[PDB]
């Protein structure tokens, strides 16, 4: 019949990275997780215990619980026409801290400074992010830079 | 041809006049649309709506839920307003003075209010006393104290009262309700 076991189809998903097999390096267990941390899930094939289901691979969530060797991560899986709440019990080897918030944090502290230094200067701030605007006008120089004229080339084979 | 972004010809889904046919109800509704159109006071807009609410959404306000409201800091001289009937509660032993304006007062609670030295105002006397609702404290009854809402959202692990006629053991209490008869919920 058909097959649909718990790790079905994960041939390459749980493979190990090229020339990167073996013990997990000792920082993986030196990282520290707190309730509220945003973490990325990537299962480690070498650590069978406390492993996410293939669905939660590549998926980011928030820790809600911190145990001896593990973290509880709630994740919103969308079943049907709605999202449900899913809490996962992962071990520290399959989780990792998401830099998806660093850009935000790096922008918060920066935003405070831009604001304090401008206020203590004389207002005029503007610290929302804006998209890429079109280019401005410019004058390009011909000096040392005469236009090299091109034409399409004929047909050849060289085989 | 327009690519519509929203359902077309959709009713707002809020009542517009009470569904009741009571003449006197329509008169109070008459009074209060006027007040609500020409006063800029919010209290009139709220009151105007409550007059449309169906009997479910007019749970009785007990006389003791009122006495509680007057125990709020700085709320004890406010004149409470109930857009519904007010029921007596034999469980409070001391009731304060104050003025309660309602659609109905039960025989029991009108006593308990008047006895302790208060006053029972119909919602139009209230309009005259307080066109902007000055010094009013509107109380609503408890809506989900209704019995029927026990059965709403029934389902596995929802803890939610089966629509049952006779009860007791022998009445939906075995397989699927205990670890030893198949499973539990």
């Amino acid at each position: 019949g058909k097959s649909h076991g718990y790790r079905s189809r994960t041939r390459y998903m749980f493979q190990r990275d090229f020339r990167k097999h073996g013990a997990v390096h000792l920082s993986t267990y030196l990282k520290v997780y707190k309730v509220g941390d945003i973490v990325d899930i990537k299962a480690n094939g070498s650590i069978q215990k406390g492993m996410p289901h293939k669905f939660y691979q590549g998926k980011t969530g928030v820790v809600y619980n911190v145990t001896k060797s593990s973290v509880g991560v709630i994740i919103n899986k969308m079943v049907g026409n709605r999202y449900l709440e899913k809490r996962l019990n992962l071990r520290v080897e399959h989780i990792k801290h998401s830099k998806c918030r660093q850009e935000f944090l790096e922008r918060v502290k920066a935003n405070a400074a831009k604001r304090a230094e401008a206020k203590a200067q004389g207002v005029a701030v503007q610290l929302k992010r804006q998209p890429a605007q079109p280019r401005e006008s410019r004058i390009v120089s011909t000096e040392g830079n005469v236009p090299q004229t091109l034409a399409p080339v004929p047909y050849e084979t060289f085989i | 041809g327009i690519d519509h972004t929203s359902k077309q010809h959709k009713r707002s889904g809020h009542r517009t006049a009470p569904k009741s046919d009571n003449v006197y109800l329509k008169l109070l509704v008459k009074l209060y649309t006027f007040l609500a159109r020409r006063t800029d006071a919010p209290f009139n807009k709220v009151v105007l709506k409550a007059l449309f609410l169906s009997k479910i959404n007019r749970p009785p306000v007990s006389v003791s839920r009122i006495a509680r409201a007057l125990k709020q800091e700085g709320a004890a001289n406010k004149t409470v307003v109930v857009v519904g009937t007010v029921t007596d509660d034999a469980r409070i032993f001391e009731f304060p003075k104050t003025t309660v304006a309602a659609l109905r007062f039960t025989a029991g609670a009108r006593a308990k209010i008047v006895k302790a030295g208060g006053e029972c105002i119909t919602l139009d006397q209230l309009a005259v006393r307080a066109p902007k609702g000055q010094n009013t404290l509107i109380l609503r009854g408890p809506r989900n104290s209704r019995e029927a809402v026990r059965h709403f959202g029934m389902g596995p692990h929802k803890g939610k009262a089966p629509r049952i006629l006779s009860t007791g053991r022998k009445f939906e209490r075995a397989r699927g309700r205990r670890r030893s008869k198949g499973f539990k919920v």
Partner: protein
Amino acid sequence: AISKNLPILKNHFRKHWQERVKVHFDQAGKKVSRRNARATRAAKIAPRP
């Protein structure tokens, strides 16, 4: 014939019940008849009560 979230009912109508329906159409009848029955017993019974 099981559907929706409805209370399980027990409407015992699987015998030939329509044969044994008693409508008390004579309710007013038999009260009139009971009142007259006592008004006769009263009179038969002399001053006894």
